[PDB]
Amino acid sequence: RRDWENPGVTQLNRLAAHPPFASWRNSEEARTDRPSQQLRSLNGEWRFAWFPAPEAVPESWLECDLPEADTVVVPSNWQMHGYDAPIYTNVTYPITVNPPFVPTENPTGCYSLTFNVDESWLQEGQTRIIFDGVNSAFHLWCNGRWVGYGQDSRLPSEFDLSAFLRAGENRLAVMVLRWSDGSYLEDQDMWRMSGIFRDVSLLHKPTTQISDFHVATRFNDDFSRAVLEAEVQMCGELRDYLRVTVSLWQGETQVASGTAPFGGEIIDERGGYADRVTLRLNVENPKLWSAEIPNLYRAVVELHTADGTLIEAEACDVGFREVRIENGLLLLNGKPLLIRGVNRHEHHPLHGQVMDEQTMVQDILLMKQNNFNAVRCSHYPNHPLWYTLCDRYGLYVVDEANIETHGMVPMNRLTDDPRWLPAMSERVTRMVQRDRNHPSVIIWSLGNESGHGANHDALYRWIKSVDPSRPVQYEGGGADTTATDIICPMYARVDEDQPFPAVPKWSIKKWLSLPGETRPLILCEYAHAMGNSLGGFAKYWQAFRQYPRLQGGFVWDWVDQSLIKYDENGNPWSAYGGDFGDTPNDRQFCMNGLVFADRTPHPALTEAKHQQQFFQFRLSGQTIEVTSEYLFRHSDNELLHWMVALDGKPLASGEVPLDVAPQGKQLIELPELPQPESAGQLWLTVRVVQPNATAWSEAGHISAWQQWRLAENLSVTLPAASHAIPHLTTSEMDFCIELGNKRWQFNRQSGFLSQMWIGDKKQLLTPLRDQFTRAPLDNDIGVSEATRIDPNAWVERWKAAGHYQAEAALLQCTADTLADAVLITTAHAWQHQGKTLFISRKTYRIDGSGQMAITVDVEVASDTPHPARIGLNCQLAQVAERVNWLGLGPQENYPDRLTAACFDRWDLPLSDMYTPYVFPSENGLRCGTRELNYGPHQWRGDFQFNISRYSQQQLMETSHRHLLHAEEGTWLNIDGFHMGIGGDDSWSPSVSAEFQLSAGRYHYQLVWCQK
Amino acid sequence: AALLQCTADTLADAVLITTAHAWQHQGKTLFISRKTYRIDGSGQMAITVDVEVASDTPHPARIGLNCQLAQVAERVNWLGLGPQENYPDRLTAACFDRWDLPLSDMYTPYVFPSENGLRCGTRELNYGPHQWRGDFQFNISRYSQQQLMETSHRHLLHAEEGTWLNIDGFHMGIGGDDSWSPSVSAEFQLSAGRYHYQLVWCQK
Ligand SMILES: *[C@@H]1C[C@@H](O)[C@@H](O)[C@@H](CO)O1
Ligand SMILES: [Mg+2]
Ligand SMILES: [Mg+2]
Ligand SMILES: [Mg+2]
Ligand SMILES: [Mg+2]
Ligand SMILES: [Mg+2]
Ligand SMILES: [Mg+2]
Ligand SMILES: [Mg+2]
Ligand code: NA
Ligand code: NA
Ligand code: NA
Ligand code: NA
Ligand code: NA
């Protein structure tokens, strides 16, 4: 029947979907969520064999183990074990588009397991198997007899094995298809893998059982009274002596309890549900659930007889909270949310798409630690434990159906086709059925990038109907269609409109007020964090805070989808699209996260943490005003530390308790500050510190900071005049300057500082020269490829204007002696095919003090694309251990991504001055630097710099970080000006005009000296 | 203007004067101006100016130079934005080209006198025998800034001897969203802390 090439057959013999069950036979266990003897795990060592197509599978395999099979761990993705290649493609389907057909060569994973079943499970009751995740479709047999079939790789498929097992050993056989008609609905932008990748379990339920239960919590107007409503359904034989008891506990205290026999109220002319009952429990003063304070109760559902015998118990954690949209705003417990969100895929560099509790916990802790309060399950229902952790740790979740048909043309070709309604329907209804009792889920999503089709509208309504408790969103077809309660665009810019036909991306501020519009706006994806990015992040946050209806967004995305590969030497390396021989592929486009695949943060994470702070500050005088952005909690685990320093020299500091109500203000007065010892800028830095450990942070965790310039006393003190005067030596070839142990050499034919000596040591490996380019960031490159050049990308514009190829032409090189110094004057023109791109005019003044002052004035032709940078660079002879500077830090920071950085004195090992992005590019800059120290050198002024063992040239010629090799010496890039890095998206120019180097004329000055 | 340094050096084809001043108030240094004046065998005087402004002092109205020229000429010819008065936050209507107007048109007769007549984005200014070149904003008239601020009605102003020239490297916006509270937008306030500008003064 080739059920896998028929969207009319998404399953065969599968059981109804339902919330997490465990069939406890002891109620106290159900109360405490302890392991149930009735829910067993089948994870571990299974038998597996790979075949190129289902037709190649031998019939012997149904009844007997194939001798050639290997033993492997389950769950797993077979690509991760090396049986075939994983493929990374973004939009284009990995298979020919010819629905509902799939290729005849269709990788087939034959899994089997021999396992025991105790007779006790078979004497009474029902034994079902549950496959939490099989990608993408499969047939199941038990003891050689066919049981059923299933699709939708991201929801559990359950089958009744009752009539198929026997006491003792039994053998399961699972034939898993890599491609199926379900693949047409699984076009997410991620690695394409397959296999039994989520848990496998066996659950015993009594014949008379709890088959479903839904929990709702409704409130009075001020939230001081709620009613907990639990609708309970059974399967099995109704009998008057049956009862259901629903009890509610807060910790170890029972808050309420109610019992009733089965029999629902009348629904229509034929009566009511004799097999259901609804219990209603009053709760006074409930402790409310939020991501700020995830208060939870425990609902325990007992099915039992009137005489008191328990049949079974099921249960769930309950979060008393209301979610509603009113007057244009999304409210949680009656207060408007400000979503500090992130999209997060289930990805692990070694295990592929297999998730584990440790990784889940690690992500959640980092998220909270970085001021995130919400996650979007891009773009499918997650492993069930995710929801439980979000309930308990506290994060708002957008749960999204596993439906994405991005590669179709037009994108809604399937979603507007009624023949595809059934399959889509199962992906939305089965999700709701499974996840509707989790308080962490606050919004349902109909999927991702599948255009807007009538199937969406029907499904949107179904949800609205079954679960009025949470809003429904969906971005396809323009982000504001009739299938979404929230305007939820992806990559809409703050101020700039992108009026694409049919599905324009309006500026978010403008979108809210279009004629007739009244919904809240929350970006489903924004601030594409690919590579060196997150430029302009603060512009979003400023807009979210000023506009009530701009309720935030989900950054794209949490973690790079890089995979580990091993070299000839067995050393691991981070790989991306095409590294597995996969083609076509979308290369590094799968790496867009705030963290590397191993969870090490990229530099952008600190920017997000700062902008997403929950405390806002203002300074007037020496009075700090702290405003809380929390909606429910008081600042009961926070103190404010303040420190004032003079050019990095600590002058004073203090601590003050913070006692701020949600939404309130606190005024703190700083102590009188004594006058500073010398000239310079005083800087105030404040930090919110949590003194006590929480479930998600260590004692001492810093959750917020801010800085301001205080008084500045400019220096007017004349410098003690040199006891020595430098000597110039003129030669045809060079101008040399000597001062004591120092010597400076300027080549007359190049017009550059070609060498410097300290004692008998040469200081340079390459001369000091102007630099106007950078090893292109992912955002500079966009969709440009050598085979498909995108002429609009910044990289292409620079390349085309000859910025990377320009050669310096000397216009002038002269020397003069002053009363106390030597002055070298140069002028160079960089040209390209007859065009003068830039002109650099400089003066170098070396005085009796040994300092070399460099003054630079650059002219940039108005008609050349604005350059990536304006600065100098050189390769120093030395390699030193530390980098010390007075400027913004400590982490990498760029013009449009420096708000999180603080001005102070920093000292790091040199390696920390290099950010190892997987795809190498310009990196490691630090801006607003007034003093930089390295080895015996010191540079002073007001510049941006980067320092590392890799030249810009090497960075731009290298595709993977693991192939980089340290150069001799150290590459210093010192810039007077640097362009923004952008990131609103990574496939179109996104650097805002204010961060482009369009001034035409630029001036900067550096002093180079000995430390 | 306290003098911090004033030197002279003789070069190959020129004389270089270097200066540094600090403007203070009550012992507080508000601004520091560092300059070099390079006079070459061509007779042109190149002035380079680097100013530092205390971060804690209110952002200043302008950063430039001024003098009262002996000369009174009939016309003002410039290559920059015009022909009418234009300020940083009010210059979109002005066009860049070569303008030439009578002196009096370089003064705007606001009934309540104030700074006025500025022209921005100027690359070359000609007046009498003088020529200034750079990338500056300027105003030129028979009235000093001092006289304008001390006079409440335009009919009371009197032409001073000669001509007052105000040449700025930078000038603050004029604002106007309202006229009773500070209204010049952040991007038009001179808050950069360090400012650089250069001009060449020559005859003809
Ligand atoms: C939004 C959808 C997501 O799956 C990615 O494709 C992202 C771009 O990397 O855009
Ligand atoms: Mg099918
Ligand atoms: Mg037991
Ligand atoms: Mg047996
Ligand atoms: Mg997509
Ligand atoms: Mg390709
Ligand atoms: Mg700040
Ligand atoms: Mg214009
Ligand atoms: Na808002
Ligand atoms: Na991507
Ligand atoms: Na506190
Ligand atoms: Na590169
Ligand atoms: Na006046």
GROMACS .gro file of N, CA and C in nm, chain A residues 4 10 74 84 151 209 215 221 224 230 267 320 377 496 540 575 623 679 774 867:
model
   60
    4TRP      N    1   0.323   0.541   0.294
    4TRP     CA    2   0.411   0.657   0.309
    4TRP      C    3   0.411   0.749   0.188
   10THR      N    4  -0.215   0.879   0.763
   10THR     CA    5  -0.109   0.932   0.846
   10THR      C    6  -0.085   0.834   0.958
   74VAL      N    7   1.937   0.346   2.154
   74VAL     CA    8   1.810   0.405   2.120
   74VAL      C    9   1.761   0.474   2.247
   84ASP      N   10   2.433   0.689   0.733
   84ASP     CA   11   2.410   0.766   0.614
   84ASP      C   12   2.435   0.912   0.651
  151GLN      N   13   0.292   0.843   1.140
  151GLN     CA   14   0.363   0.958   1.086
  151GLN      C   15   0.359   1.070   1.190
  209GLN      N   16  -1.025   0.273   3.278
  209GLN     CA   17  -0.919   0.368   3.299
  209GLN      C   18  -0.953   0.512   3.266
  215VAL      N   19  -0.737   2.020   3.254
  215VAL     CA   20  -0.742   2.105   3.374
  215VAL      C   21  -0.753   2.249   3.335
  221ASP      N   22  -1.207   3.881   3.936
  221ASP     CA   23  -1.147   3.996   3.876
  221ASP      C   24  -1.010   4.038   3.930
  224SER      N   25  -0.799   3.689   4.332
  224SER     CA   26  -0.786   3.643   4.470
  224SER      C   27  -0.870   3.517   4.493
  230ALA      N   28  -1.171   2.026   3.641
  230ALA     CA   29  -1.103   1.911   3.584
  230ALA      C   30  -1.206   1.821   3.517
  267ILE      N   31  -2.583   1.769   2.722
  267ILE     CA   32  -2.516   1.851   2.621
  267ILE      C   33  -2.612   1.882   2.510
  320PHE      N   34  -0.163   2.822   3.829
  320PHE     CA   35  -0.285   2.904   3.826
  320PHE      C   36  -0.247   3.032   3.752
  377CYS      N   37   0.891   2.697   2.066
  377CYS     CA   38   0.938   2.565   2.023
  377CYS      C   39   0.950   2.557   1.868
  496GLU      N   40   1.257   5.082   0.983
  496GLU     CA   41   1.256   5.070   0.838
  496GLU      C   42   1.152   4.979   0.777
  540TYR      N   43   1.561   4.746   1.920
  540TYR     CA   44   1.436   4.673   1.941
  540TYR      C   45   1.386   4.697   2.082
  575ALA      N   46   3.121   2.121   1.222
  575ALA     CA   47   3.087   2.118   1.081
  575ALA      C   48   2.949   2.176   1.057
  623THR      N   49   2.162   6.077   4.247
  623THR     CA   50   2.045   6.003   4.285
  623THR      C   51   2.015   5.903   4.175
  679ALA      N   52   4.336   6.458   3.703
  679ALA     CA   53   4.246   6.476   3.589
  679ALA      C   54   4.191   6.344   3.536
  774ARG      N   55   3.741   4.457   0.594
  774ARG     CA   56   3.740   4.358   0.701
  774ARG      C   57   3.711   4.222   0.637
  867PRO      N   58   3.309   5.215   0.349
  867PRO     CA   59   3.401   5.112   0.388
  867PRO      C   60   3.374   5.053   0.523
   0.00000   0.00000   0.00000
